[PDB]
Design a protein around this motif. Structure first.
Motif, mmCIF file in Angstrom:
data_model
loop_
_atom_site.group_PDB
_atom_site.id
_atom_site.type_symbol
_atom_site.label_atom_id
_atom_site.label_comp_id
_atom_site.label_asym_id
_atom_site.label_seq_id
_atom_site.Cartn_x
_atom_site.Cartn_y
_atom_site.Cartn_z
ATOM 1 N N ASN A 180 0.835 -1.186 0.000
ATOM 2 C CA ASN A 180 0.000 0.000 0.000
ATOM 3 C C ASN A 180 0.871 1.237 0.000
ATOM 4 O OD1 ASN A 180 -2.057 1.756 2.332
ATOM 5 N ND2 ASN A 180 -2.311 1.630 0.136
ATOM 6 N N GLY A 181 0.670 2.104 -0.982
ATOM 7 C CA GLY A 181 1.594 3.200 -1.169
ATOM 8 C C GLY A 181 1.512 4.261 -0.099
ATOM 9 N N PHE A 182 0.377 4.369 0.585
ATOM 10 C CA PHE A 182 0.229 5.364 1.632
ATOM 11 C C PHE A 182 0.965 4.974 2.886
ATOM 12 C CE2 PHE A 182 -4.002 6.001 -0.330
ATOM 13 C CZ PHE A 182 -3.709 7.162 -0.881
ATOM 14 N N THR A 183 0.971 3.690 3.201
ATOM 15 C CA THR A 183 1.410 3.201 4.487
ATOM 16 C C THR A 183 2.416 2.079 4.430
ATOM 17 O OG1 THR A 183 0.683 2.356 6.594
ATOM 18 C CG2 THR A 183 -0.376 1.514 4.677
ATOM 19 N N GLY A 184 2.681 1.514 3.260
ATOM 20 C CA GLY A 184 3.778 0.601 3.064
ATOM 21 C C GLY A 184 3.476 -0.845 3.346
ATOM 22 N N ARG A 185 2.412 -1.145 4.062
ATOM 23 C CA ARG A 185 2.141 -2.509 4.461
ATOM 24 C C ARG A 185 1.570 -3.287 3.295
ATOM 25 N NH1 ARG A 185 -1.777 -5.639 5.289
ATOM 26 N NH2 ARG A 185 -2.188 -6.940 7.094
ATOM 27 N N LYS A 186 1.870 -4.578 3.239
ATOM 28 C CA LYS A 186 1.337 -5.392 2.165
ATOM 29 C C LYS A 186 -0.168 -5.300 2.171
ATOM 30 C CE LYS A 186 4.650 -9.031 2.737
ATOM 31 N NZ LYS A 186 4.941 -10.390 2.333
ATOM 32 N N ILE A 187 -0.780 -5.643 1.058
ATOM 33 C CA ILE A 187 -2.222 -5.801 1.019
ATOM 34 C C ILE A 187 -2.510 -7.279 1.172
ATOM 35 C CG2 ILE A 187 -4.181 -5.690 -0.496
ATOM 36 C CD1 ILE A 187 -2.813 -3.056 -1.484
ATOM 37 N N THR A 188 -3.516 -7.613 1.967
ATOM 38 C CA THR A 188 -3.734 -9.014 2.281
ATOM 39 C C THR A 188 -4.071 -9.825 1.049
ATOM 40 O OG1 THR A 188 -4.389 -8.538 4.527
ATOM 41 C CG2 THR A 188 -5.078 -10.600 3.578
ATOM 42 N N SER A 189 -4.741 -9.237 0.076
ATOM 43 C CA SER A 189 -5.034 -9.952 -1.153
ATOM 44 C C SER A 189 -3.913 -9.735 -2.155
ATOM 45 C CB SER A 189 -6.343 -9.476 -1.751
ATOM 46 O OG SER A 189 -7.395 -9.639 -0.839
ATOM 47 N N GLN A 190 -3.877 -10.568 -3.192
ATOM 48 C CA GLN A 190 -2.963 -10.367 -4.300
ATOM 49 C C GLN A 190 -3.711 -9.735 -5.448
ATOM 50 O OE1 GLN A 190 -3.005 -13.731 -2.921
ATOM 51 N NE2 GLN A 190 -1.487 -12.958 -1.512
ATOM 52 N N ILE A 191 -3.184 -8.679 -5.979
ATOM 53 C CA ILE A 191 -3.873 -7.887 -6.985
ATOM 54 C C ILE A 191 -3.460 -8.391 -8.347
ATOM 55 C CG2 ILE A 191 -4.459 -5.570 -7.679
ATOM 56 C CD1 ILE A 191 -4.930 -6.372 -4.691
ATOM 57 N N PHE A 192 -4.405 -8.407 -9.284
ATOM 58 C CA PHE A 192 -4.179 -8.846 -10.653
ATOM 59 C C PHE A 192 -3.750 -7.644 -11.468
ATOM 60 C CE2 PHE A 192 -6.029 -9.237 -14.871
ATOM 61 C CZ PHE A 192 -5.450 -10.348 -15.312
ATOM 62 N N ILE A 193 -2.573 -7.714 -12.076
ATOM 63 C CA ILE A 193 -1.982 -6.567 -12.747
ATOM 64 C C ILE A 193 -1.243 -7.034 -13.990
ATOM 65 C CG2 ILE A 193 -0.040 -6.711 -11.192
ATOM 66 C CD1 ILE A 193 0.147 -3.633 -11.568
ATOM 67 N N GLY A 194 -1.380 -6.274 -15.082
ATOM 68 C CA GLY A 194 -0.629 -6.508 -16.298
ATOM 69 C C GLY A 194 -0.855 -5.423 -17.333
ATOM 70 N N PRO A 195 -0.282 -5.550 -18.533
ATOM 71 C CA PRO A 195 -0.393 -4.463 -19.516
ATOM 72 C C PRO A 195 -1.607 -4.591 -20.421
ATOM 73 C CG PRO A 195 1.740 -5.464 -19.566
ATOM 74 C CD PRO A 195 0.842 -6.411 -18.891
ATOM 75 N N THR A 196 -2.418 -3.537 -20.478
ATOM 76 C CA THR A 196 -3.644 -3.518 -21.262
ATOM 77 C C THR A 196 -3.664 -2.276 -22.130
ATOM 78 O OG1 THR A 196 -4.760 -4.616 -19.452
ATOM 79 C CG2 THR A 196 -6.099 -3.749 -21.160
ATOM 80 N N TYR A 197 -4.310 -2.373 -23.281
ATOM 81 C CA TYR A 197 -4.374 -1.287 -24.245
ATOM 82 C C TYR A 197 -5.597 -0.443 -23.992
ATOM 83 C CZ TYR A 197 -3.836 0.754 -28.837
ATOM 84 O OH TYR A 197 -3.577 1.597 -29.869
ATOM 85 N N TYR A 198 -5.409 0.809 -23.607
ATOM 86 C CA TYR A 198 -6.514 1.743 -23.526
ATOM 87 C C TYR A 198 -6.517 2.808 -24.599
ATOM 88 C CZ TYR A 198 -8.474 0.382 -19.143
ATOM 89 O OH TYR A 198 -9.098 -0.283 -18.141
ATOM 90 N N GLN A 199 -7.692 3.396 -24.717
ATOM 91 C CA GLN A 199 -8.030 4.441 -25.651
ATOM 92 C C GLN A 199 -8.436 5.657 -24.851
ATOM 93 O OE1 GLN A 199 -11.045 1.985 -27.045
ATOM 94 N NE2 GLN A 199 -9.935 1.262 -28.801
ATOM 95 N N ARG A 200 -8.371 6.812 -25.477
ATOM 96 C CA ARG A 200 -8.871 8.038 -24.887
ATOM 97 C C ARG A 200 -9.959 8.592 -25.778
ATOM 98 N NH1 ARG A 200 -5.977 13.796 -23.648
ATOM 99 N NH2 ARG A 200 -7.553 14.458 -22.191
ATOM 100 N N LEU A 201 -11.185 8.529 -25.313
ATOM 101 C CA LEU A 201 -12.312 8.946 -26.112
ATOM 102 C C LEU A 201 -12.435 10.459 -26.116
ATOM 103 C CD1 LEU A 201 -14.808 6.401 -24.795
ATOM 104 C CD2 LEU A 201 -13.173 5.995 -26.504
ATOM 105 N N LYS A 202 -13.082 10.966 -27.159
ATOM 106 C CA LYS A 202 -13.123 12.389 -27.456
ATOM 107 C C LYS A 202 -13.885 13.209 -26.434
ATOM 108 C CE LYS A 202 -16.132 13.370 -30.772
ATOM 109 N NZ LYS A 202 -17.252 13.243 -31.736
ATOM 110 N N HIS A 203 -14.473 12.585 -25.415
ATOM 111 C CA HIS A 203 -15.413 13.261 -24.525
ATOM 112 C C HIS A 203 -14.719 13.740 -23.272
ATOM 113 C CE1 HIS A 203 -18.379 11.570 -27.164
ATOM 114 N NE2 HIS A 203 -17.971 10.353 -26.865
ATOM 115 N N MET A 204 -14.245 14.970 -23.322
ATOM 116 C CA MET A 204 -13.511 15.583 -22.240
ATOM 117 C C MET A 204 -14.434 16.522 -21.486
ATOM 118 S SD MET A 204 -10.591 16.694 -24.900
ATOM 119 C CE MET A 204 -9.946 15.541 -26.078
ATOM 120 N N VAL A 205 -14.224 16.631 -20.178
ATOM 121 C CA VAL A 205 -15.125 17.407 -19.336
ATOM 122 C C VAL A 205 -15.058 18.882 -19.663
ATOM 123 C CG1 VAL A 205 -13.393 17.523 -17.513
ATOM 124 C CG2 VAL A 205 -15.730 17.996 -17.025
ATOM 125 N N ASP A 206 -13.945 19.350 -20.203
ATOM 126 C CA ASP A 206 -13.821 20.771 -20.479
ATOM 127 C C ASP A 206 -14.755 21.228 -21.583
ATOM 128 O OD1 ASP A 206 -12.009 21.295 -18.491
ATOM 129 O OD2 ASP A 206 -10.361 21.820 -19.825
#
Lengths: 48, 50
Positions: free
Chosen positions: A1-27
RNA sequence: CAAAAUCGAGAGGA
């Protein structure tokens, strides 16, 4: 955990995925009106 | 039975300007023009023999 | 001291 350094009890699923950025911006969607212009026929606010 | 047509004021039929100065008229102003045209025309024709 | 039209078509968003 990045705030406090302690492990997280569960194991998180992580890997590389392809994202897109859609044209709909809040501005392009924030809007606000307080007594601006109005329509000419019925003196009610314009649209848009 | 319609004998005295009512003509609504300019606030019901405003004259919107162009981005330049060509003043478009409403649909309703056009129709009133056509009515007065044909009213004068029919008045002169029936006034004589027709 | 308020400046900046209307009407139809199409594509989108939730």
């Amino acid at each position: 955990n990045g705030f406090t350094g302690r492990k997280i009890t569960s194991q998180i699923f992580i890997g590389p995925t392809y994202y897109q950025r859609l044209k709909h911006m809040v501005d392009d969607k924030i809007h606000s009106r307080a007594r601006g212009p109005i329509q000419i026929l019925n003196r009610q606010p314009m649209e848009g | 039975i319609v004998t005295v047509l009512p003509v609504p004021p300019l606030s019901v039929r405003p004259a919107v300007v162009m981005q330049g100065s060509a003043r478009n008229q409403d649909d309703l102003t056009h129709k009133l023009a056509d009515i007065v045209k044909i009213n004068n025309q029919l008045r002169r024709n029936e006034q004589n023999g027709a």
